Write a protein that binds this ligand. Structure first.
Ligand code: BOG
Ligand code: BOG
Ligand code: BOG
Ligand code: BOG
Ligand code: BOG
Ligand code: BOG
Ligand code: BOG
Ligand code: BOG
Ligand code: BOG
Ligand code: BOG
Ligand code: PFF
Ligand code: PFF
Ligand code: NA
Ligand code: NA
Ligand code: NA
Ligand code: NA
Lengths: 509, 509
């Protein structure tokens, strides 16, 4: 089995897995919608009670499974729990990352397309003037790129440029993945992560210099880091915070598991795990948080910024920020650096999200790396046409796989590892080979606190928030639901084909 | 490998394959739309120049492949032409019947649901009066069953009864298929075909007794069998006639091939093939043709009947005929006999349409019969939700797979067998074991006349008829196109997995 060549390469690859569009696009929107500093206390508590323990748990499960030649959850779940139901539940660790891949790579392709056009100066020219005279050209720029519906049909019409750039993005992901773990992912991570950090720091510095009659970058920081204790009682803030923690640390996607399955059987995961997670948190709260919000607040004031963030998920990063930059000397190039940053943030993450599918085809169906990568790319590419051409399909996939799915899977994987497989056996598996040991308190966190936290969360979620979406949606959501249910059935069938293959091999020996 | 137990069982099973909804529902509509007797000369010529030769060709290819343990076209095409492209082209012999299955079984389920309600007298009561006061209750009856859209959203809402009956229909197909070739399909065919013939003859007799001030059943017959020679110059009539010939004889669906792969290597196919095809033609022109049209013409006159047929594909058999029957003594029960007839016609055909997928999973992926049947049923059932809930999805599948697809595949399979593999070698393969030999003239038909006929047909088709559908459709057609393209990719992947399995088995020996 392939292994990570160096410890640094391991850490940077795992940091690249976690550090992504979630740090720079999702986090600021989530924090801004939920009162800035009011979002941060639940967020921090979620990092400690959920983020950290699940990270160690997923590293352990992957390392454990990798030692036996298995990097994905259909097989790994079965190793921890010898029941046919474990294989079925394991299918989610293939389904979640595949479905997320289908929209994540497409959004990643936009950052590349924007980087290209911003570099060559093929951007909108605002009148040299109210905010809307500045923002509108950039709104139309995004709208023409992804092809937002101009009528009442729920159909998107991406530009030819956007489509070709998606193909190129897919090509770039394949070029890295096809070279494997050490010579592809690990090697790229060593080049990508320092670069990414450099760009982000520069952007933070450049944004900290923003100043207008409406305020400064410092105002944006104070809004993000000023605690509001009268919001700790709102369930909505906790749900948003835990969902961000999952999304940001790549947890519940079966993808930390798969990466960890290339860690050598006795190699450390306690310090490595903690370090990869802390690296992500710094890139998130210090870098991601210091760019978008402070810039928006400096130009529009706190109240307007919050309204912008609420407007959409992509408004702040694809419209507002580049519009703001356009009013600053060298702002088009700064727009380029921002989109180039997002692209490397996306790319280092999308190779991670597609690897579980690759690992499954290699490990369980005995495909070569070449074939596993190409077939995986083929499924993601073909499937992405749904997200490219059907308005709101992206939203539906992100809800079922990237939002609900990950929390459910987080709880599932913990129960299987710490309850079914055995708490003391799990505790010993995590700690084996550790450069440091997991603090004793975290045994009781993992066994009792974390599962109860997630279970209560999911209950409050399904009671007071999901019935508002099962009745209040356009019929076209069923196209996406139909298709991704079909993907789950497809993956179940492959797991079935893999158990049959394993049986025929065992018979002929 | 499984084989047909008896020659009679073989013939009746192959007759059941061919004799179906196409004989009783499709043929009358096609003939009525295309001028009755004006349709019949092209139809007869198509039977002789296309129907017969392709039938012998498909029996031969299946018997040939079966001798080597292969019943489907990905492998069989490769045996006749040792090129990677033959496997890819072979995928259509899995894709066409699977896509057709997805809508054919659902329509079959309607005949069962109607049979049930007509038996128990849970039918509409017309006022005891213009034609529309009689027809409307039956139109609403069909519309409430399949759930035709009442607004402007392209969404169907099938009754709970229709849905459960679909599940039962799937269950009934599985119960037969899971018992295999001789103990399932062949056994059922021996029971189903005489029954079906009996019902049809009775219905023909009962319809021949229909008489109203508007005309008699004899008027309907004269319209169907009175030649119009000024229509032999219209390409549209020839296209309709050849498409019906394909659909009716089950040709181009990879399904005659698969059935024939259970015929013993030296067993006759010339007489058996001709007999199965003549049996279908009798059930079509004599039985199918003598029920719907003569009844419609007897009650409404020739001109009104033609208009009814043009109204839709299901109008004549699901609305008009039962409405007409309702005006006759014992007419509700006669409605039941009609729908019971359609159901057995559908059932004997849908077990045939799903067998290529079963044969592929057995032959190439080494699945047991149980698993192959259950997984096949699972894909058809899941996939049928598209046809059940999206208005016009059925139409789109029937065009690409059941209409264009079969003619393309007919031409493809002939070129591969009679041109690539070798005309003299093909001619000898067909004739080997024959109780009679194929008339010498048919060598030149198969080699020269048939492929040129189909090629010209496809050209005239794609030039003057398909651009009117690539521009003139609602955007929702892309949902279906997207999904069935995804099915083709899925099947290509399985063919890929099968070649990999074959290679690993050959290495370990
Ligand atoms: C049904 C699934 C596959 C159908 C083929 C669709 C391939 C994409 O089609 C392409 O989309 C681009 C972006 O909108 C357009 O600019 C191109 O003109 C168009 O050819
Ligand atoms: C990495 C570069 C990707 C190349 C994709 C370019 C396709 C752009 O597309 C074309 O751009 C032209 C610009 O003159 C326009 O005139 C055309 O309307 C447009 O179709
Ligand atoms: C699930 C979505 C499947 C992809 C089908 C959309 C591809 C339609 O194909 C083409 O798309 C382009 C952009 O609309 C345009 O060139 C044309 O309008 C259209 O023919
Ligand atoms: C859920 C939040 C818990 C995070 C606090 C962890 C800090 C570590 O806490 C320390 O752990 C050591 C090893 O177990 C002990 O020797 C110390 O007494 C203890 O203070
Ligand atoms: C691809 C075929 C689409 C079938 C859609 C049929 C169901 C449409 O029903 C829709 O369901 C939505 C989601 O629960 C609800 O929000 C809406 O009230 C309703 O319009
Ligand atoms: C998205 C693909 C699977 C979604 C589940 C749909 C299962 C069908 O749903 C059923 O449809 C019947 C017929 O319309 C209704 O009568 C039932 O109330 C409904 O539960
Ligand atoms: C083979 C028999 C299939 C059983 C399916 C029956 C489901 C019918 O469905 C129910 O029928 C009731 C009749 O009283 C109606 O009152 C209900 O509205 C309807 O939901
Ligand atoms: C491709 C189609 C996927 C199937 C999705 C439709 C299933 C919607 O599910 C249910 O369908 C029933 C009939 O509309 C009703 O009970 C409800 O409106 C709906 O919730
Ligand atoms: C394409 C339509 C052709 C159908 C006509 C076939 C009738 C058989 O025709 C006969 O075939 C025999 C064997 O080859 C010959 O001995 C006879 O001379 C010939 O008349
Ligand atoms: C599931 C996502 C649907 C994407 C649909 C995008 C293409 C819509 O384009 C449609 O194409 C039809 C078929 O060629 C044409 O008949 C219509 O002119 C056009 O509206
Ligand atoms: N953690 C990534 C998202 C992600 C990456 C990799 C994954 F495997 C899953 C999810 C981000 O914040 O963008
Ligand atoms: N020949 C069948 C249709 C059909 C049956 C079986 C098949 F395998 C394909 C097509 C009919 O006329 O209803
Ligand atoms: Na992250
Ligand atoms: Na990343
Ligand atoms: Na037929
Ligand atoms: Na039949």
């Amino acid at each position: 089995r392939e292994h990570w060549a160096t410890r640094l390469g391991l850490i940077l690859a795992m940091a690249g897995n976690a550090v992504g569009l979630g740090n720079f696009l999702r986090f600021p929107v989530q924090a801004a919608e939920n009162g800035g500093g009011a979002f941060m206390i639940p967020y921090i508590i979620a990092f400690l009670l959920v983020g950290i323990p699940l990270m160690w748990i997923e590293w352990a499960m992957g390392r454990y499974g990798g030692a036996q030649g298995h990097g994905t959850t259909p097989a790994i779940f079965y190793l921890l729990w010898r029941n046919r139901f474990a294989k079925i539940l394991g299918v989610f660790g293939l389904w979640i990352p595949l479905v997320v891949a289908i929209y994540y790579v497409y959004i990643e392709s936009w950052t590349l397309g924007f980087a290209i056009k911003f570099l060559v100066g093929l951007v909108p020219e605002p009148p040299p003037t109210d905010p809307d005279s500045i923002l509108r050209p950039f709104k139309e720029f995004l709208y023409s790129y992804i092809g937002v519906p101009k009528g009442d049909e729920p159909i998107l019409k991406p530009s030819l440029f956007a489509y070709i750039v998606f193909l190129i993005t897919m090509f770039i992901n394949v070029s890295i993945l096809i070279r494997g773990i050490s010579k592809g992912i690990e090697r790229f991570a060593k080049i990508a992560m320092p670069t990414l950090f450099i760009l982000a720091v520069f952007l933070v510095i450049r944004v900290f210099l923003l100043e207008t009659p409406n305020g400064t970058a410092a105002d944006g920081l104070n809004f993000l880091w000023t605690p509001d204790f009268e919001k700790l009682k709102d369930p909505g803030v906790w749900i948003a915070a835990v969902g961000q923690i999952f999304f940001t640390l790549s947890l519940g996607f079966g993808a930390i598991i798969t990466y960890a399955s290339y860690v050598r059987k006795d190699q450390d995961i306690v310090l490595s795990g903690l370090t990869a997670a802390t690296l992500n948190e710094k890139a998130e709260v210090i870098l991601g948080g210091s760019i978008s919000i402070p810039a928006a607040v400096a130009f529009f004031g706190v109240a307007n910024a919050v309204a912008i963030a609420k407007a959409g998920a992509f408004n702040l990063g694809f419209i507002t920020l580049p519009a703001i930059f356009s009013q600053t000397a060298g702002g088009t190039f700064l727009g380029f650096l921002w989109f180039f940053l997002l692209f490397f943030a996306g790319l280092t993450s999308s190779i991670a999200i597609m690897q579980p599918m690759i690992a499954f085809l290699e490990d369980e169906l005995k495909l070569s790396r070449k074939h596993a990568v190409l077939w995986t790319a083929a499924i993601v590419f073909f499937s992405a046409h749904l997200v490219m051409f059907l308005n709101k399909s992206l939203d539906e996939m992100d809800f079922w796989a990237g939002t609900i799915g990950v929390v459910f899977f987080g709880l599932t994987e913990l129960i299987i590892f710490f309850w079914i497989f055995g708490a003391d056996k799990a505790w010993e598996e995590i700690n084996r080979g550790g450069i440091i040991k997991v603090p004793r308190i975290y045994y009781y966190v993992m066994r009792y606190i974390t599962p109860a936290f997630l279970a209560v969360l999911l209950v409050v979620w399904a009671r007071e928030y999901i019935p508002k979406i099962m009745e209040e949606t356009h019929w076209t959501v069923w196209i996406t639901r139909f298709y991704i249910i079909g993907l789950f059935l497809f993956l179940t069938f492959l797991v079935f084909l893999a158990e049959r293959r394993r049986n025929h091999e065992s018979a002929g020996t």
